[PDB]
Each structure stands twice: as C-alpha cells, then as structure tokens.
Amino acid sequence: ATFEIVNRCSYTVWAAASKGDAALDAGGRQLNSGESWTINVEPGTKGGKIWARTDCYFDDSGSGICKTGDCGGLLRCKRFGRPPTTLAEFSLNQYGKDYIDISNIKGFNVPMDFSPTTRGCRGVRCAADIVGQCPAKLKAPGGGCNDACTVFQTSEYCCTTGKCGPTEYSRFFKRLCPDAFSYVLDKPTTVTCPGSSNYRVTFCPTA
C-alpha cells in the first residue's frame, strides 16, 4: 500500500511511520513545508501509525531528539512516538478490508487529514487548533496538547480496566475533533476502506 505523507504546515515536521515493533518503510524523514514523502506499507500491516514530530535535531547518524513524538531519538522510527502525537492509524487487509482512523488518545501535536487516494471510502480529519485551545492542565511544555492518560496516569483516563467513560478532558478533544478517537472506549470513528486502498496523510490540511 502506498501512503503519500504531505506536510502542508508552514513549519518543518519529521514524519514517522511505525507498527510499534518495527519501522514502516524507512520509518522517518524530514518534511520541510510543502514536501511529500511516498512510503510503501506492507499489505496486512496491523496497528500501523503515522505521525508528525516537531522541533527535531538529528546528527549525521540519524540520532537526536524531537520536542513532540520522539521515537527513542531516532530519525528513522522503529517504535511509537512520545506523546503528544496526533495519530493516523491503520490496519490493512484485515479480512478483505482496510481500517483507518485518526486518534487523539496519545494527545495532539499537529493537525492532520488521513484520506484514501483510491475509491470506496471517505477520509477523516482532525484539523482544529487543539494546541491553541488546549486545557491548561494538558498543555505540554515541550509543545502540543497531552491526553489525560499521559498526564495523570489513572485507570479512568488510561482505561486500564476496560471500564472507563468519557471525561472532561476526552470531551475537549471530541468537541474540537468529533472524527478522531478521544479516549480508548470512544464510539469508533474508524472508516472501512476496500482492502489494499492507497492513502494520503496531510499535516496542517487547512493551513
């Protein structure tokens, strides 16, 4: 499956793509404003994620740090990123269909649109100014808007027991972005696409 990752932000981002225990394609790359990076994701990839990282520094060996979404200090991510990270999530070729969503369960750093470039389903978007509107207690000093589980580490926010409800904090993400997961047990906003669809993830789709 091909994913075109486009940075429409006015600032550079360092895109990242991982399935948690491995990189997807090269795993990460710098995307200056307007740049597009096309990756190939193996069919059948389950639990794949694409995200942006902000304010990164990398040396000649691809080691450094990002203010948001750092993945163990690597330019080429092999693991998931440090919250806050807006997430484009996908599971491909799952019983003949692909499943995509956007999630704010690990917070929000950059606005995103995640849409198919092929026929048969719609895209999803979370493009509201969640960092600007972020509740004081969720603001990440390093940048972004943390989810409540990251900040408070409670069973209710982390949905540890599988018995959690929405919260004042999850409702904030849901109000700004109805089409993204706001907490683990949110009413799903997953979109079913034809198996083997292709996609585009656009950072800052509106600006």
Rosetta silent file (secondary structure, phi, psi, omega in degrees, C-alpha in Angstrom):
SEQUENCE: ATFEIVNRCSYTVWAAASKGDAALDAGGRQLNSGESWTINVEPGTKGGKIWARTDCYFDDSGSGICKTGDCGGLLRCKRFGRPPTTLAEFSLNQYGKDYIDISNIKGFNVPMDFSPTTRGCRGVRCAADIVGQCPAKLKAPGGGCNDACTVFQTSEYCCTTGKCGPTEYSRFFKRLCPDAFSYVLDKPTTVTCPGSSNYRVTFCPTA
SCORE:     score description
SCORE:     0.000 S_00000001
   1 L     0.000  140.504  179.443    0.000    0.000    0.000 S_00000001
   2 E  -102.028  138.107  173.381    1.234    3.443   -0.788 S_00000001
   3 E  -122.940  121.927  172.333    0.956    6.315    1.627 S_00000001
   4 E   -94.717  125.351 -178.798    1.815    9.804    0.451 S_00000001
   5 E  -109.938  117.060 -172.736    2.746   11.893    3.511 S_00000001
   6 E  -118.035  130.929  177.342    2.434   15.597    2.775 S_00000001
   7 E  -100.383  102.832  176.175    3.487   18.455    5.047 S_00000001
   8 L   -92.852   -0.748  177.183    1.190   21.456    4.361 S_00000001
   9 L   -64.828  155.290  177.559    2.356   23.065    7.664 S_00000001
  10 L   -77.982  -11.299  179.913    4.332   26.303    7.462 S_00000001
  11 L  -111.657  154.097  175.082    6.948   24.607    9.681 S_00000001
  12 L   -66.721  142.431  170.375    9.149   21.568    9.099 S_00000001
  13 E  -126.763  160.468  174.449    7.942   18.278   10.533 S_00000001
  14 E  -115.942  101.822 -179.815    9.709   14.948   10.787 S_00000001
  15 E   -65.839  151.893  179.583    7.240   12.338    9.641 S_00000001
  16 E  -141.735  146.884 -178.327    7.303    8.933   11.287 S_00000001
  17 E  -145.505  122.238 -175.731    5.780    5.586   10.386 S_00000001
  18 E  -152.540  158.671  171.172    5.880    2.510   12.595 S_00000001
  19 L  -111.508   14.694  173.520    3.928   -0.590   13.629 S_00000001
  20 L    98.683  -38.144  177.617    5.373   -0.440   17.180 S_00000001
  21 L  -115.241    3.739  179.557    7.972   -3.209   16.923 S_00000001
  22 L  -163.418  158.070  171.596    9.341   -2.104   13.518 S_00000001
  23 E   -71.919  153.330  167.413    9.635    0.803   11.120 S_00000001
  24 E  -103.823  125.193 -174.862    7.213    1.067    8.198 S_00000001
  25 E    57.185 -137.055  178.616    9.350    1.759    5.093 S_00000001
  26 E   -72.962  -10.390  176.720   12.323    3.959    6.209 S_00000001
  27 E    84.785  -29.579  179.897   10.402    4.810    9.424 S_00000001
  28 E  -170.275  156.932  178.878   11.005    8.561    9.363 S_00000001
  29 E  -165.881  151.788  173.808   12.085   11.514    7.276 S_00000001
  30 E   -76.491  137.983  174.581   12.280   15.273    7.414 S_00000001
  31 E  -127.808  103.653  173.605    9.483   17.055    5.537 S_00000001
  32 L   -68.539  169.430  179.163   10.015   20.745    5.022 S_00000001
  33 L   -54.571  122.410  177.697    6.910   22.864    4.365 S_00000001
  34 L    94.900  -14.639 -178.867    5.232   21.572    1.200 S_00000001
  35 L   -70.638  150.073  179.541    7.310   18.372    0.875 S_00000001
  36 E  -125.135  137.995  179.071    5.737   14.981    0.101 S_00000001
  37 E  -127.776  121.460  179.925    7.189   11.616    1.035 S_00000001
  38 E   -99.709  124.488  177.638    5.756    8.418   -0.516 S_00000001
  39 E  -116.668  158.111  175.948    6.106    5.251    1.523 S_00000001
  40 E  -113.276  126.322  179.253    5.228    1.664    0.934 S_00000001
  41 L  -112.692  127.544 -179.574    3.497   -0.193    3.754 S_00000001
  42 L   -56.857  132.080  173.307    3.338   -3.981    3.521 S_00000001
  43 L   -53.867  149.634 -177.431   -0.216   -5.363    2.935 S_00000001
  44 L    81.248   -0.742  178.293   -1.636   -6.953    6.092 S_00000001
  45 L   -58.982  123.604 -179.272    0.106   -4.383    8.371 S_00000001
  46 L  -111.254  129.349  177.896   -1.876   -4.368   11.630 S_00000001
  47 L    71.457   38.442  175.920   -1.654   -1.463   14.026 S_00000001
  48 E   -83.438  150.027  179.367    0.384    0.846   11.824 S_00000001
  49 E  -140.759  144.820  172.748    0.680    4.536   12.731 S_00000001
  50 E  -127.049  138.648  179.079    1.912    7.677   11.024 S_00000001
  51 E  -149.127  168.628  173.505    2.574   10.878   12.932 S_00000001
  52 E  -103.893  151.281  172.348    4.484   14.141   12.747 S_00000001
  53 E  -121.049  140.531 -177.632    7.306   15.135   15.049 S_00000001
  54 E  -115.708  152.738  175.970    8.140   18.781   15.775 S_00000001
  55 E    49.946   63.046 -178.437   11.325   20.689   16.601 S_00000001
  56 E  -100.197  151.617  173.214   13.771   17.843   15.917 S_00000001
  57 E  -133.021  128.098  176.786   17.553   17.809   15.910 S_00000001
  58 E  -134.623  141.261  175.973   19.454   14.888   14.338 S_00000001
  59 L   -85.100 -175.383  179.027   23.172   14.365   13.841 S_00000001
  60 L   -60.330  -19.847  178.671   24.842   12.776   10.736 S_00000001
  61 L   -94.621    2.143 -179.727   23.978    9.251   12.150 S_00000001
  62 L    76.991   30.875  177.804   20.221    9.999   12.460 S_00000001
  63 E  -119.786  139.459 -178.856   20.262   10.338   16.299 S_00000001
  64 E   175.156 -136.190 -176.324   18.865   13.227   18.235 S_00000001
  65 E  -156.675  152.619  171.593   15.619   14.393   19.773 S_00000001
  66 E  -124.536  144.544  177.596   12.157   15.827   18.936 S_00000001
  67 E   -68.566  -33.238  174.853   10.034   18.070   21.172 S_00000001
  68 E  -131.622  143.151  173.820    6.961   16.065   20.225 S_00000001
  69 L    70.419   19.395  178.884    6.661   12.487   19.058 S_00000001
  70 L   -58.004  136.796 -178.502   10.281   11.435   19.640 S_00000001
  71 L  -116.710   76.936 -179.830   10.821    7.709   18.973 S_00000001
  72 L    58.964   29.832  175.683   13.849    6.828   21.119 S_00000001
  73 L    72.658   15.209 -178.377   15.816    9.667   19.495 S_00000001
  74 E   -97.660  141.614  172.243   15.908    8.177   16.028 S_00000001
  75 L   -67.527  -46.386 -178.645   15.277    9.948   12.753 S_00000001
  76 L   -92.973   89.586 -177.456   14.131    6.560   11.345 S_00000001
  77 L   -57.807  133.492  173.638   11.472    5.450   13.835 S_00000001
  78 L  -112.670  -17.859 -177.535   11.299    1.773   14.762 S_00000001
  79 L  -128.969  171.478  176.083    8.906    2.312   17.699 S_00000001
  80 L   -68.177  158.391 -175.882    5.933    4.582   18.509 S_00000001
  81 L   -89.571  157.981 -179.328    6.493    8.214   19.432 S_00000001
  82 L   -72.009  127.215  176.233    6.391   10.022   22.725 S_00000001
  83 L   -58.705  151.681    9.365    3.047   11.843   23.292 S_00000001
  84 L   -89.064  133.296  179.037    1.663   14.268   22.386 S_00000001
  85 L  -141.471  118.867  170.164    1.172   12.891   18.893 S_00000001
  86 L   -68.533  133.630 -174.980   -1.867   13.157   16.622 S_00000001
  87 E  -117.329  131.441  167.290   -2.055    9.650   15.113 S_00000001
  88 E   -94.977  115.009 -173.063   -3.102    8.373   11.683 S_00000001
  89 E  -115.449  141.607 -178.475   -3.874    4.687   12.478 S_00000001
  90 E  -153.744  148.549  172.648   -4.435    1.834   10.115 S_00000001
  91 E  -132.745  120.816 -171.232   -4.812   -1.917    9.809 S_00000001
  92 E  -104.578  143.525  175.028   -4.596   -3.155    6.260 S_00000001
  93 E    53.994   53.869  178.332   -6.086   -6.220    4.631 S_00000001
  94 E  -102.658   99.624 -177.094   -7.988   -7.383    7.696 S_00000001
  95 L    53.164   42.622  174.560  -10.416   -9.940    6.332 S_00000001
  96 L    88.551    0.813 -178.593  -10.544   -8.148    2.959 S_00000001
  97 E  -131.901  161.162  173.652  -10.859   -4.574    4.233 S_00000001
  98 E  -109.149  151.241 -179.214   -8.644   -1.748    5.462 S_00000001
  99 E  -129.062  121.465 -178.657   -9.455    0.191    8.631 S_00000001
 100 E  -124.690  151.712  172.875   -8.341    3.756    9.160 S_00000001
 101 E  -158.761  169.107  167.483   -8.802    6.372   11.854 S_00000001
 102 E  -114.050  141.097 -179.164   -7.321    9.426   13.486 S_00000001
 103 E  -131.017  136.696  170.359   -6.706    9.262   17.242 S_00000001
 104 L  -105.799   16.209 -179.139   -6.124   11.837   19.953 S_00000001
 105 L   -64.278  -26.554  179.066   -5.728    9.045   22.620 S_00000001
 106 L  -109.799   28.959  177.989   -1.991    9.908   22.740 S_00000001
 107 L    82.179 -169.923 -175.791   -2.663   13.658   22.532 S_00000001
 108 E  -140.210  134.698  176.171   -2.334   16.092   19.684 S_00000001
 109 L  -126.231  -42.940 -175.684    0.608   17.947   18.229 S_00000001
 110 L  -133.058  140.591  177.263   -0.097   18.675   14.539 S_00000001
 111 L   -69.344  152.787 -174.266   -3.453   18.821   12.665 S_00000001
 112 E  -150.616  148.518  168.259   -3.989   16.061   10.112 S_00000001
 113 E  -117.866  138.351  178.446   -6.183   14.751    7.306 S_00000001
 114 E  -131.915  107.290 -173.502   -5.977   11.000    6.545 S_00000001
 115 E  -131.731  151.319  171.871   -7.768   10.138    3.342 S_00000001
 116 E   -72.060  148.987  174.351   -7.802    7.365    0.729 S_00000001
 117 L  -103.502   -2.682  178.658   -6.340    8.317   -2.689 S_00000001
 118 L  -114.347  169.736 -175.229   -8.297    5.356   -4.165 S_00000001
 119 L   -74.064  160.118  167.691  -12.080    4.757   -4.441 S_00000001
 120 L   106.388    0.733  178.022  -14.595    3.407   -1.920 S_00000001
 121 L  -164.311  171.382 -179.246  -14.492    5.260    1.424 S_00000001
 122 L  -102.768  168.947  175.143  -14.120    8.713    2.894 S_00000001
 123 L   -97.105  173.291  176.629  -11.245   10.290    4.753 S_00000001
 124 E  -126.544  156.803 -175.666  -11.092   11.527    8.343 S_00000001
 125 E  -148.453  143.613  168.373   -9.671   14.753    9.668 S_00000001
 126 E  -135.286   93.966 -173.356   -8.662   16.471   12.879 S_00000001
 127 L  -118.220    8.543  179.970   -7.671   19.998   11.845 S_00000001
 128 L   -72.486  161.404 -178.811   -8.932   22.163   14.719 S_00000001
 129 L   -84.226   70.511 -178.027   -6.484   24.270   16.745 S_00000001
 130 H   -67.106  -33.757  178.400   -6.251   21.795   19.621 S_00000001
 131 H   -65.971  -44.418 -178.198   -2.826   23.130   20.761 S_00000001
 132 H   -64.276  -35.454 -177.644   -4.125   26.721   20.952 S_00000001
 133 H   -93.460   -3.706 -174.383   -7.291   25.663   22.777 S_00000001
 134 L   -47.240  129.956  171.712   -5.634   23.003   24.960 S_00000001
 135 L   -53.877  141.220 -178.794   -6.834   22.945   28.613 S_00000001
 136 H   -47.121  -44.499 -175.441   -4.100   24.358   30.891 S_00000001
 137 H   -70.865  -17.835  179.188   -3.520   21.051   32.713 S_00000001
 138 H   -97.772  -11.359 -177.575   -2.993   19.154   29.412 S_00000001
 139 E   -59.257  129.635  179.451   -0.571   21.656   27.786 S_00000001
 140 L   -91.828  119.697 -178.807    2.752   20.001   27.038 S_00000001
 141 L   -56.631  -35.764  175.603    5.643   22.398   27.926 S_00000001
 142 L   -70.684   -6.361 -179.715    7.661   20.731   25.167 S_00000001
 143 L   117.234  147.164  178.707    4.786   21.557   22.769 S_00000001
 144 L    92.392 -176.665 -177.014    1.354   20.054   21.973 S_00000001
 145 E  -126.570  108.752 -177.349   -1.692   19.002   23.981 S_00000001
 146 L   -71.552  152.506  168.589   -1.302   15.856   26.030 S_00000001
 147 L   -75.123  160.930 -178.355   -4.029   13.281   26.544 S_00000001
 148 H   -68.937  -28.366  178.061   -5.216   12.876   30.168 S_00000001
 149 H   -65.125  -47.651  177.806   -3.784    9.342   30.498 S_00000001
 150 H   -56.907  -45.251 -176.411   -0.258   10.637   29.783 S_00000001
 151 H   -70.325  -47.451 -168.974   -0.657   13.496   32.272 S_00000001
 152 H  -106.042  -19.002  174.072   -2.487   11.779   35.153 S_00000001
 153 L    53.133   50.536  175.233   -1.886    8.015   34.799 S_00000001
 154 L  -108.535  159.324  176.304   -5.253    6.943   36.221 S_00000001
 155 H   -61.890  -34.921 -176.902   -7.290    3.832   35.414 S_00000001
 156 H   -67.235  -45.882 -178.669  -10.120    6.124   34.255 S_00000001
 157 H   -74.941  -34.345 -177.786   -8.101    8.075   31.699 S_00000001
 158 H   -86.914   -8.869  179.979   -5.973    5.106   30.581 S_00000001
 159 L    55.183   41.411 -175.322   -8.978    2.756   30.505 S_00000001
 160 L   -57.844  -41.744 -176.650   -6.915    0.145   32.231 S_00000001
 161 L   -83.114  -12.365 -176.164   -9.915   -1.968   33.412 S_00000001
 162 L    79.467   12.946 -178.156  -11.726   -1.659   30.055 S_00000001
 163 L  -134.649   83.282  166.283  -14.414    0.146   32.114 S_00000001
 164 L  -133.255  156.319  174.002  -13.871    3.842   31.552 S_00000001
 165 L  -117.096  178.168  172.221  -16.249    6.553   30.390 S_00000001
 166 L   -64.961  160.262 -176.745  -15.669    9.868   28.633 S_00000001
 167 L  -133.671  172.490  176.329  -14.140   12.615   30.765 S_00000001
 168 H   -58.113  -39.729 -179.890  -13.915   16.403   30.796 S_00000001
 169 H   -70.878  -43.899 -179.802  -10.547   16.013   29.064 S_00000001
 170 H   -64.679  -33.970 -178.247  -11.661   13.467   26.449 S_00000001
 171 H   -66.381  -27.057  175.554  -14.717   15.675   25.688 S_00000001
 172 H   -64.485  -51.635  179.003  -12.372   18.568   24.853 S_00000001
 173 H   -61.303  -38.424 -178.039  -10.633   16.529   22.147 S_00000001
 174 H   -68.762  -35.623  178.682  -14.017   15.226   20.970 S_00000001
 175 H   -65.280  -44.129 -177.639  -15.550   18.714   20.805 S_00000001
 176 H   -75.001  -36.344 -176.424  -12.685   20.067   18.687 S_00000001
 177 L  -134.385   81.306 -178.880  -12.331   16.848   16.629 S_00000001
 178 L   -60.520  -24.550 -174.341  -15.506   14.720   16.527 S_00000001
 179 L   -92.518   12.615  176.988  -13.958   12.418   13.885 S_00000001
 180 E  -123.739  148.379  175.271  -10.999   11.291   15.983 S_00000001
 181 E   -61.240  130.150 -179.618  -10.829    8.908   18.956 S_00000001
 182 L  -104.172  -19.504  176.308  -10.826   10.977   22.143 S_00000001
 183 L  -156.205  165.976 -173.435  -10.391    8.112   24.649 S_00000001
 184 L   -53.859  -44.060 -175.738   -9.838    4.317   24.428 S_00000001
 185 L   -97.413   22.365  177.593  -13.553    3.408   24.592 S_00000001
 186 L   -59.944  151.992  174.629  -14.813    6.215   22.400 S_00000001
 187 L   -58.533  121.315 -174.905  -17.629    5.383   19.945 S_00000001
 188 L   -57.241  138.041  175.925  -15.423    4.329   16.986 S_00000001
 189 L  -112.040   21.055  178.181  -14.701    6.793   14.191 S_00000001
 190 L   -69.623  140.004  178.951  -12.905    4.074   12.194 S_00000001
 191 E  -109.545  134.369  177.685  -13.574    4.090    8.469 S_00000001
 192 E   -93.195  121.766  177.207  -13.793    0.857    6.486 S_00000001
 193 E  -113.833  159.423  172.793  -11.980    1.076    3.160 S_00000001
 194 E   -55.958  146.936  176.368  -11.589   -1.562    0.399 S_00000001
 195 L   -58.212  141.973  179.208   -8.696   -3.922    1.130 S_00000001
 196 L    66.438   33.017  175.676   -5.432   -2.630   -0.439 S_00000001
 197 L   -74.976  166.314  173.706   -6.556    1.021   -0.732 S_00000001
 198 L  -116.368  158.734 -169.954   -3.855    3.769   -1.005 S_00000001
 199 E  -139.859  166.163  170.556   -3.767    6.860    1.177 S_00000001
 200 E  -132.901  132.966  173.538   -2.508   10.343    1.821 S_00000001
 201 E  -109.411  118.484  179.448   -1.740   11.759    5.273 S_00000001
 202 E  -112.424  119.417  174.204   -1.657   15.591    5.106 S_00000001
 203 E   -81.762  140.188 -177.147   -0.253   17.579    8.048 S_00000001
 204 L    52.258   58.291 -176.039   -1.955   21.004    8.503 S_00000001
 205 L   -62.675  -24.982 -177.730   -4.574   20.278    5.802 S_00000001
 206 L   -97.348  -14.316 -177.009   -6.304   23.651    6.223 S_00000001
 207 L  -155.194    0.000    0.000   -3.155   25.881    6.595 S_00000001
